[PDB]
């Protein structure tokens, strides 16, 4: 019930923070831009559990 | 005098449990089970394990 929702919230928080970090560090020298990579989570049943 | 106890053989519902080793029959039939003595039995409860 809450597993589909709190995992999506925790994923979108890190996706916002890795954008804010690039926006902050856009002026330094040896910086490389990062992106998140997610993947879904499944049990042995057919419905999903989040991300 | 009580002549006998007679059982109603209509089907129930189909509860979904999401487990792996379980089956449920939807029409007429019975699973055949063999005990340790050798005598055979017939059943409808579908919880199996190893």
UniProtKB/Swiss-Prot annotation, chain A:
Superkingdom assignment: Bacteria
Cell compartment(s), UniProt: Bacterial flagellum basal body
Family, similarity comment: Belongs to the flagella basal body rod proteins family.
Name assigned to this protein: Flagellar hook protein FlgE
Organism of this sequence: Salmonella typhimurium (strain LT2 / SGSC1412 / ATCC 700720)
Residue span relative to the full protein: 2 to 52 of 403
